[PDB]
Copies of this chain bind each other. A is one copy, B any other.
Amino acid sequence: MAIPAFHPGELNVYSAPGDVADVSRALRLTGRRVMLVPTMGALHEGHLALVRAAKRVPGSVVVVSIFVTPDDDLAQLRAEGVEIAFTPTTAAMYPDGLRTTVQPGPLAAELEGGPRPTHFAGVLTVVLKLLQIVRPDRVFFGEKDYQQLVLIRQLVADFNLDVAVVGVPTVREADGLAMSSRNRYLDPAQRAAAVALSAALTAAAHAATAGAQAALDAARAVLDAAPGVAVDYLELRDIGLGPMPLNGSGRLLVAARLGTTRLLDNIAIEIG
């Protein structure tokens, strides 16, 4: 078949899975390294950082999937030098309805999977599909949703996928608040209090020279000094989200409700 039109150096928008599949394959054959940046909802600075990270790989072509000013998101992508936007309808992604799906391992039942027990099954299923449509050399996710990032590394490993998963350190507001589309709903008292999540985590990371309990108790003190911050969990795990070893590398994760908004954050921890 003819390869659908692709104009190098321009923003090319495809809604058909088949079309982006054919183009990406044609590009892979001409030498380019295909980079995938999946996105959902309205575009934010976190996504732009994923884009910049992918663009700096030499000979990259950047594919951004968008799976909801939508025209201004596209103008933003063009201004970033993105050459492919993949914009399929729900129908195109699911022409036979919900059928074969991915079932995550037991990690999906933990932490975020407590309030939302089937959320990661849906994420892993759509990510697998995006991975098979585009076949990128590398796929880029923020570390903000660290549990989601870990789950797709497990997906990649367990299903023997050929793709490199790249986690990009979380972009933050100037006071530390982790980027998220939810931040826009916070009133000013909520926005001032929400700084406690990141303040607690960075405190814990520095307190960690004094060991794991000192790191945890520092985090909890900072969370305790904030009004209207209902902590759902505060957990120190290994970097794979298994139990924290006695010392070594780890990750500290927090989730909290401020009014009706659920905020999450996490950070690298090194014990002692």
Contact indicator B158/A133 (Cβ below 8 Å): no
Other A-B pairs, 14, CB within 8 Å; known A132-B161, A133-B160: A21-B162, A99-B104, A99-B105, A99-B106, A100-B103, A100-B104, A100-B158, A101-B105, A102-B102, A129-B159, A132-B159, A132-B160, A132-B162, A135-B162
Q: Is A71 an interface residue (CB 8 A)?
A: no
- Minimum-distance CB pairs A-B, first 4: A99-B105, A100-B158, A103-B103, A132-B160
| Cβ < 8 Å to B, chain A residues 113-160 | 121, 124, 128-129, 132-133, 135, 151, 154-155, 157-160
How many copies are assembled? 2
* Complex alpha-carbon distance, A129 and B157, angstroms: 10
Also in contact, A96 and B132, with CB within 8 A (given A102-B102, A103-B103): no
Whether A17 sits at the interface, judged by CB under 8 Å, is: yes
**Which residues on the B side are within 8 Å of A100 (C-beta)?**
102-105, 124, 151, 154-155, 158-159
Cβ distance A16 to chain B, nearest Cβ, rounded Å:
12
A54 to nearest B CB, angstroms? 21
A77 to chain B, nearest CB (A): 23
Q: Are B160 and A129 in contact (CB under 8 A)?
A: yes
Interface size class of chain A, counting residues whose CB lies under 8 Å from the partner chain: 20 to 34
Q: Which residues of B contact A133 (CB under 8 A)?
A: 160
Q: Which residues of B contact A106 (CB under 8 A)?
A: 99
For this complex, 7 residue pairs linking A to B, each with C-beta atoms less than 8 Å apart, are: A17-B160, A21-B160, A99-B106, A100-B124, A100-B154, A101-B158, A132-B159
Question: Measured between C-beta atoms, what is the minimum distance from A150 to chain B in Å?
Answer: 11
Q: In whole angstroms, how far apart are the Cα atoms of A215 and B158 in the complex? A: 45
Q: Which residues of B contact A102 (CB under 8 A)?
A: 100-103
Residues B128 and A159 in contact, CB atoms below 8 Å apart: yes
In the bound complex, CA of A129 to CA of B102 (Å): 13
Q: How far is the CA of A161 from the CA of B161 in the complex (A)?
A: 12
Residues of B within 8 A of A161 (CB): 132
CB distance from A60 to the nearest CB of B (A): 20
Interface string of A89-107 (1 = CB under 8 A from B): 0000000101111111110
Complex Cα spacing A106 to B101, Å: 11
Look across to chain B and name the residue whose beta carbon is closest to the beta carbon of A99: B105
Chain B residue contacts of A101, Cβ below 8 A? 102-103, 105, 158
Nearest B residue to A108, CB-CB: B100
Chain B residues with Cβ below 8 Å from A151 are 100
Write out the residue numbers on chain B whose beta carbons fall within 8 Å of the beta carbon of A155: 100
Give chain B residues whose Cβ lies under 8 Å from the Cβ of A98: 105
How far apart sit A135 and B159, CA to CA, in the bound complex (Å)? 12
